[PDB]
Protein backbone atom coordinates (compact mmCIF):
# COMPACT_ATOMS: atom_id res chain seq x y z
CA UNK A 1 0.00 0.00 0.00
CA UNK A 2 1.40 3.39 -1.15
CA UNK A 3 0.33 6.03 1.41
CA UNK A 4 -2.69 5.19 3.58
CA UNK A 5 -2.18 4.07 7.18
CA UNK A 6 -0.87 1.19 9.30
CA UNK A 7 -3.59 -1.09 10.71
CA UNK A 8 -4.04 -4.38 12.57
CA UNK A 9 -6.06 -7.50 11.68
CA UNK A 10 -9.02 -6.38 13.91
CA UNK A 11 -9.72 -3.72 11.20
CA UNK A 12 -9.77 -6.36 8.38
CA UNK A 13 -10.35 -9.73 10.12
CA UNK A 14 -11.08 -11.60 6.83
CA UNK A 15 -7.57 -10.71 5.54
CA UNK A 16 -5.48 -13.83 4.76
CA UNK A 17 -1.67 -13.74 4.51
CA UNK A 18 -0.37 -16.29 1.93
CA UNK A 19 3.27 -17.55 1.94
CA UNK A 20 5.22 -20.09 -0.16
CA UNK A 21 7.85 -22.55 1.19
CA UNK A 22 10.89 -22.96 -1.17
CA UNK A 23 13.44 -25.81 -1.66
CA UNK A 24 15.28 -24.92 1.32
CA UNK A 25 12.70 -24.45 3.78
CA UNK A 26 12.77 -20.61 3.43
CA UNK A 27 9.20 -19.13 3.48
CA UNK A 28 8.42 -15.91 1.49
CA UNK A 29 5.23 -13.81 1.30
CA UNK A 30 3.20 -14.30 -1.92
CA UNK A 31 -0.11 -12.42 -1.79
CA UNK A 32 -3.17 -11.44 0.24
CA UNK A 33 -6.56 -13.15 0.26
CA UNK A 34 -10.00 -12.87 1.93
CA UNK A 35 -11.82 -15.44 4.13
CA UNK A 36 -15.33 -15.88 2.53
CA UNK A 37 -16.27 -18.98 4.62
CA UNK A 38 -14.49 -20.91 7.42
CA UNK A 39 -12.75 -23.31 4.93
CA UNK A 40 -12.36 -20.90 1.92
CA UNK A 41 -9.97 -18.01 1.11
CA UNK A 42 -10.38 -16.13 -2.21
CA UNK A 43 -7.35 -14.56 -3.94
CA UNK A 44 -5.89 -13.98 -7.48
CA UNK A 45 -4.79 -16.81 -9.89
CA UNK A 46 -1.69 -14.77 -10.97
CA UNK A 47 -0.29 -15.24 -7.41
CA UNK A 48 -0.09 -19.06 -7.97
CA UNK A 49 -0.09 -19.75 -11.78
CA UNK A 50 3.72 -20.35 -11.94
CA UNK A 51 3.73 -22.59 -8.78
CA UNK A 52 0.31 -24.31 -8.78
CA UNK A 53 1.23 -27.09 -6.25
CA UNK A 54 -1.01 -26.73 -3.10
CA UNK A 55 1.73 -28.24 -0.81
CA UNK A 56 4.01 -25.16 -1.43
CA UNK A 57 1.68 -22.73 0.45
CA UNK A 58 0.93 -21.62 4.03
CA UNK A 59 -2.10 -19.40 4.87
CA UNK A 60 -2.38 -17.35 8.09
CA UNK A 61 -5.55 -15.75 9.48
CA UNK A 62 -5.58 -13.25 12.37
CA UNK A 63 -2.07 -12.01 11.42
CA UNK A 64 -1.16 -8.24 11.66
CA UNK A 65 2.63 -8.59 11.02
CA UNK A 66 4.51 -10.04 8.04
CA UNK A 67 7.46 -11.91 9.66
CA UNK A 68 6.36 -12.13 13.35
CA UNK A 69 3.47 -14.08 14.94
CA UNK A 70 0.33 -12.21 16.05
CA UNK A 71 -1.32 -13.46 19.28
CA UNK A 72 -4.39 -15.59 18.35
CA UNK A 73 -3.32 -16.22 14.71
CA UNK A 74 -4.19 -19.52 12.95
CA UNK A 75 -1.90 -21.36 10.47
CA UNK A 76 -3.31 -23.52 7.61
CA UNK A 77 -2.12 -25.81 4.86
CA UNK A 78 -3.84 -25.50 1.45
CA UNK A 79 -6.09 -28.57 1.02
CA UNK A 80 -6.96 -27.45 -2.56
CA UNK A 81 -5.61 -24.61 -4.79
CA UNK A 82 -8.30 -23.79 -7.43
CA UNK A 83 -7.27 -21.46 -10.30
CA UNK A 84 -9.70 -20.02 -12.91
CA UNK A 85 -9.51 -22.19 -16.10
CA UNK A 86 -10.00 -19.06 -18.32
CA UNK A 87 -7.06 -17.14 -16.74
CA UNK A 88 -5.06 -15.20 -19.40
CA UNK A 89 -2.02 -12.84 -19.08
CA UNK A 90 -1.11 -9.93 -21.45
CA UNK A 91 2.16 -8.02 -20.66
CA UNK A 92 0.00 -6.30 -17.89
CA UNK A 93 -3.65 -7.09 -17.71
CA UNK A 94 -4.83 -10.50 -16.38
CA UNK A 95 -8.31 -11.87 -17.32
CA UNK A 96 -10.30 -14.00 -14.80
CA UNK A 97 -7.71 -13.29 -12.09
CA UNK A 98 -9.46 -15.18 -9.27
CA UNK A 99 -8.46 -18.25 -7.18
CA UNK A 100 -9.83 -20.27 -4.23
CA UNK A 101 -7.75 -21.82 -1.44
CA UNK A 102 -9.45 -24.49 0.66
CA UNK A 103 -7.66 -24.16 4.04
CA UNK A 104 -7.07 -26.94 6.61
CA UNK A 105 -4.92 -26.86 9.81
CA UNK A 106 -2.54 -29.73 10.83
CA UNK A 107 -5.42 -30.76 13.22
CA UNK A 108 -7.83 -30.97 10.19
CA UNK A 109 -9.86 -27.80 11.10
CA UNK A 110 -11.00 -24.70 9.15
CA UNK A 111 -11.02 -21.08 10.48
CA UNK A 112 -12.61 -20.54 13.95
CA UNK A 113 -14.14 -17.01 14.06
CA UNK A 114 -12.68 -14.74 16.81
CA UNK A 115 -12.01 -11.02 17.42
CA UNK A 116 -9.18 -11.32 14.78
CA UNK A 117 -10.74 -13.90 12.33
CA UNK A 118 -14.08 -13.17 10.55
CA UNK A 119 -15.57 -13.81 7.06
CA UNK A 120 -16.42 -11.06 4.50
CA UNK A 121 -19.78 -11.09 2.63
CA UNK A 122 -19.81 -11.57 -1.15
CA UNK A 123 -21.75 -9.01 -3.24
CA UNK A 124 -25.11 -9.73 -4.92
CA UNK A 125 -24.63 -10.65 -8.63
CA UNK A 126 -23.93 -7.60 -10.87
CA UNK A 127 -24.46 -5.31 -7.77
CA UNK A 128 -21.54 -2.84 -7.38
CA UNK A 129 -21.33 0.65 -5.82
CA UNK A 130 -21.64 3.68 -8.19
CA UNK A 131 -18.39 5.16 -9.62
CA UNK A 132 -16.92 7.73 -7.19
CA UNK A 133 -17.71 5.46 -4.16
CA UNK A 134 -14.85 5.27 -1.58
CA UNK A 135 -13.67 1.72 -0.82
CA UNK A 136 -10.80 0.31 1.25
CA UNK A 137 -7.82 -1.87 0.22
CA UNK A 138 -5.61 -3.82 2.64
CA UNK A 139 -2.24 -5.57 2.34
CA UNK A 140 1.45 -6.12 3.12
CA UNK A 141 2.60 -4.83 -0.32
CA UNK A 142 5.30 -2.22 -0.95
CA UNK A 143 4.95 1.27 0.55
CA UNK A 144 6.91 2.79 -2.40
CA UNK A 145 7.39 1.45 -5.95
CA UNK A 146 11.22 1.72 -5.42
CA UNK A 147 11.24 -0.23 -2.09
CA UNK A 148 13.03 -3.58 -1.87
CA UNK A 149 11.29 -4.60 1.40
CA UNK A 150 7.61 -5.16 2.25
CA UNK A 151 6.33 -3.40 5.39
CA UNK A 152 6.32 -5.55 8.57
CA UNK A 153 2.93 -4.08 9.67
CA UNK A 154 -0.38 -4.47 7.75
CA UNK A 155 -1.62 -1.33 5.92
CA UNK A 156 -4.85 -0.06 4.41
CA UNK A 157 -5.97 2.91 2.33
CA UNK A 158 -9.03 4.34 0.56
CA UNK A 159 -9.46 4.55 -3.25
CA UNK A 160 -12.50 5.63 -5.34
CA UNK A 161 -14.18 3.40 -7.96
CA UNK A 162 -13.65 4.53 -11.60
CA UNK A 163 -16.28 3.78 -14.31
CA UNK A 164 -15.39 1.36 -17.15
CA UNK A 165 -16.07 4.40 -19.44
CA UNK A 166 -13.23 6.39 -17.78
CA UNK A 167 -10.82 3.43 -17.37
CA UNK A 168 -11.16 2.27 -21.04
CA UNK A 169 -9.93 5.71 -22.33
CA UNK A 170 -6.63 5.29 -24.24
CA UNK A 171 -4.79 7.61 -21.74
CA UNK A 172 -5.97 5.29 -18.89
CA UNK A 173 -5.80 1.53 -19.85
CA UNK A 174 -7.70 1.31 -23.18
CA UNK A 175 -8.69 -2.27 -24.19
CA UNK A 176 -6.64 -3.80 -21.29
CA UNK A 177 -9.68 -3.33 -18.92
CA UNK A 178 -12.90 -5.40 -19.33
CA UNK A 179 -16.35 -5.21 -17.63
CA UNK A 180 -15.14 -8.18 -15.43
CA UNK A 181 -12.59 -5.71 -13.90
CA UNK A 182 -13.00 -2.63 -11.64
CA UNK A 183 -10.59 0.32 -11.69
CA UNK A 184 -10.04 2.31 -8.46
CA UNK A 185 -7.65 5.20 -7.66
CA UNK A 186 -7.04 8.26 -5.48
CA UNK A 187 -8.08 11.58 -7.12
CA UNK A 188 -4.48 12.95 -6.56
CA UNK A 189 -2.98 9.47 -7.47
CA UNK A 190 -1.17 9.70 -4.08
CA UNK A 191 -2.31 6.35 -2.55
CA UNK A 192 -2.74 2.93 -4.20
CA UNK A 193 -2.16 -0.80 -3.94
CA UNK A 194 1.30 -2.00 -5.07
CA UNK A 195 3.45 -5.13 -5.56
CA UNK A 196 2.56 -7.71 -2.85
CA UNK A 197 -1.01 -6.34 -2.36
CA UNK A 198 -2.29 -8.69 -5.13
CA UNK A 199 -5.00 -11.14 -4.08
CA UNK A 200 -6.18 -8.91 -1.21
CA UNK A 201 -9.58 -7.29 -0.65
CA UNK A 202 -11.24 -4.19 -2.11
CA UNK A 203 -14.09 -3.70 0.42
CA UNK A 204 -17.05 -1.33 -0.16
CA UNK A 205 -20.14 -0.61 2.00
CA UNK A 206 -23.13 -1.69 -0.21
CA UNK A 207 -26.68 -1.34 1.32
CA UNK A 208 -24.89 -0.90 4.72
CA UNK A 209 -22.97 -4.26 4.51
CA UNK A 210 -19.14 -4.56 4.15
CA UNK A 211 -18.80 -6.35 0.77
CA UNK A 212 -15.84 -7.97 -1.09
CA UNK A 213 -16.33 -5.84 -4.27
CA UNK A 214 -12.85 -6.52 -5.69
CA UNK A 215 -9.61 -8.56 -5.55
CA UNK A 216 -6.29 -6.72 -6.18
CA UNK A 217 -5.22 -7.92 -9.68
CA UNK A 218 -2.89 -5.58 -11.66
CA UNK A 219 -1.78 -2.07 -12.59
CA UNK A 220 0.91 -0.10 -14.42
CA UNK A 221 3.32 0.97 -11.59
CA UNK A 222 1.71 2.24 -8.36
CA UNK A 223 0.14 5.63 -7.47
CA UNK A 224 0.84 6.85 -11.07
CA UNK A 225 -1.31 9.50 -12.81
CA UNK A 226 -3.95 7.96 -15.15
CA UNK A 227 -2.89 4.41 -14.09
CA UNK A 228 -5.49 3.10 -11.60
CA UNK A 229 -5.38 -0.11 -9.62
CA UNK A 230 -7.33 -2.89 -11.39
CA UNK A 231 -9.43 -5.36 -9.40
CA UNK A 232 -11.27 -8.57 -10.27
CA UNK A 233 -15.01 -7.65 -10.25
CA UNK A 234 -16.24 -10.29 -7.72
CA UNK A 235 -19.96 -9.59 -8.51
CA UNK A 236 -19.37 -11.12 -12.03
CA UNK A 237 -17.92 -14.43 -10.64
CA UNK A 238 -20.62 -15.61 -8.16
CA UNK A 239 -21.47 -18.83 -10.13
CA UNK A 240 -17.73 -19.74 -10.38
CA UNK A 241 -17.28 -19.13 -6.59
CA UNK A 242 -20.55 -21.00 -5.76
CA UNK A 243 -19.51 -24.12 -7.75
CA UNK A 244 -15.78 -24.26 -6.79
CA UNK A 245 -16.44 -23.81 -3.00
CA UNK A 246 -18.26 -27.23 -3.20
CA UNK A 247 -14.84 -28.90 -3.98
Amino acid sequence: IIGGEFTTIENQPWFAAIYRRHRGGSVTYVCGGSLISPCWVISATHCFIDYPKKEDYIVYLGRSRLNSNTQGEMKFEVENLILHKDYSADTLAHHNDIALLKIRSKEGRCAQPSRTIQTIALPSMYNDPQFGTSCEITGFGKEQSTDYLYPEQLKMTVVKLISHRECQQPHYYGSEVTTKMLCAADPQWKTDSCQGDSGGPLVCSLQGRMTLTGIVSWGRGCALKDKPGVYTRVSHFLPWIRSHTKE
Binding site: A89, S145, Q195, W218, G219, R220, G229
Partner: peptide, 12 residues
Protein backbone atom coordinates in the same frame (compact mmCIF):
# COMPACT_ATOMS: atom_id res chain seq x y z
CA UNK B 1 8.24 -7.69 -12.22
CA UNK B 2 7.90 -4.66 -9.83
CA UNK B 3 4.12 -4.39 -10.72
CA UNK B 4 0.96 -5.89 -9.21
CA UNK B 5 0.18 -8.86 -11.51
CA UNK B 6 3.66 -10.54 -11.53
CA UNK B 7 4.06 -11.69 -7.86
CA UNK B 8 5.53 -15.23 -7.45
CA UNK B 9 6.45 -15.48 -11.22
CA UNK B 10 9.37 -17.70 -12.40
CA UNK B 11 10.63 -15.13 -15.01
CA UNK B 12 11.02 -12.55 -12.13
Amino acid sequence: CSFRGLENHAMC
